[PDB]
Design a protein around this ligand. Structure first.
Ligand SMILES: Cc1nc2c(c(C)c(C)n2Cc2cnn(C)c2)c(-c2ccc(Cl)cc2)c1[C@H](OC(C)(C)C)C(=O)O
Ligand SMILES: Cc1nc2c(c(C)c(C)n2Cc2cnn(C)c2)c(-c2ccc(Cl)cc2)c1[C@H](OC(C)(C)C)C(=O)O
Lengths: 132, 132
């Protein structure tokens, strides 16, 4: 289904990477957040929902979504409740030297992942959303 | 052309909002940045390029792109060099009370703008990129 996203946090260099995967296409949005808090998840959800038709959200840690602030963001954006962290960490390690900050390398790995091809993840998400 | 984005900063509450507009569709990405620096523009460009096919970038302030760090981000993402800030500020003011932080209100205004309809800005950008 075109509106299903999976959201999770992973850890690297003592920092937290919030990874959102459009399940139907494998397309990734990811950001380095200062702490693994409900406020950061709520804000990230608001950002994501403004850029993509986010209908339902899955996670591998259901307690991520128990926050009063997270439920309000979902409420406001009309969101209901519905590996890749290894692939993203692999690309991060490949490009890790190309940048000082981990957050820069994360965006590089997101770029590479979404455009790597026989279409790419970025190519088939816009097709999925367009046809639907 | 589907790869043309316009990037600018605007000011509100002593803070800086970086606004990127997909010119062909009117679709907006916007973030609150701590300062109007080349590093923040470079990082924002890296984020944008990983999510959309960014080919060329325009701006209303050409000195935004003179930074050595900005030119490197463009170089790495394959980017070449090619109102709405009033409409975004208007929506921000409408939803300004719904949130404490300006950055939250910005994302709300982005959400509203991209999904307001007779298609919406978010709808026609994915169509433009899909057909192309
Ligand atoms: C912190 C930083 N400083 C930078 C650059 C660059 C290219 C230069 C010249 N400088 C100044 C410098 C470096 N060494 N010296 C002695 C001076 C980059 C960078 C790295 C890769 C890309 Cl594609 C684009 C920019 C970054 C990146 O941070 C962002 C937030 C992305 C700006 C990062 O995380 O590496
Ligand atoms: C800072 C903040 N705290 C919040 C919320 C909510 C809903 C609650 C309950 N709290 C705790 C609270 C508030 N008052 N009291 C006494 C305790 C929100 C919020 C506002 C709008 C949406 Cl859709 C979603 C969340 C935010 C937003 O920040 C982000 C970064 C988005 C979390 C913001 O900028 O308002």
């Amino acid at each position: 289904s075109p509106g299903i996203w999976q959201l999770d946090c992973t850890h690297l260099e003592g920092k937290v990477i919030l990874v959102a995967v459009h399940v139907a296409s494998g397309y990734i949005e990811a950001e380095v957040i200062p702490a693994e808090t409900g406020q950061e998840t709520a804000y990230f959800l608001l950002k994501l929902a403004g850029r993509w038709p986010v209908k339902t959200v899955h996670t591998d840690n259901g307690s991520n979504f128990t926050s009063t602030t997270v439920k309000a963001a979902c409420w406001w954006a009309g969101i209901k409740q519905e590996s890749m962290n290894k692939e993203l960490k692999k690309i991060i390690g490949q490009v890790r030297d190309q940048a000082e900050h981990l957050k820069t390398a994360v965006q590089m790995a997101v770029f590479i992942h979404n455009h790597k091809r026989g279409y790419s993840a970025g190519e088939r998400i816009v097709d999925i959303i367009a046809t639907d």
